[PDB]
């Protein structure tokens, strides 16, 4: 049941994809460490809550 994934390598030694392994030891998911592979989203719901969302080059108020 081992989980394997790619590290995002920053400073590369003079030696390419490097991996790390993770295994959960506990039944309760709350006991788990943080995966930290977090997806993002649009600012839109906050930066443009508009019913008619308009194109940046056209007049804001028409």
């Amino acid at each position: 049941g081992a989980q394997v994934s790619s590290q995002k390598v920053g400073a590369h030694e003079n030696s390419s994809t490097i991996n790390y392994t993770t295994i959960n030891y506990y039944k309760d998911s709350a006991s788990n460490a943080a995966s930290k592979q977090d997806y993002s989203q649009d600012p839109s719901k906050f930066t443009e809550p508009l019913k008619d969302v308009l194109i940046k080059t056209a007049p804001a108020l028409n």
Binding site: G1, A2, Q3, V4, S5, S6
Partner: peptide, 4 residues
């Protein structure tokens, strides 16, 4: 295993 499970490789992503």
């Amino acid at each position: 295993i499970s490789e992503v």
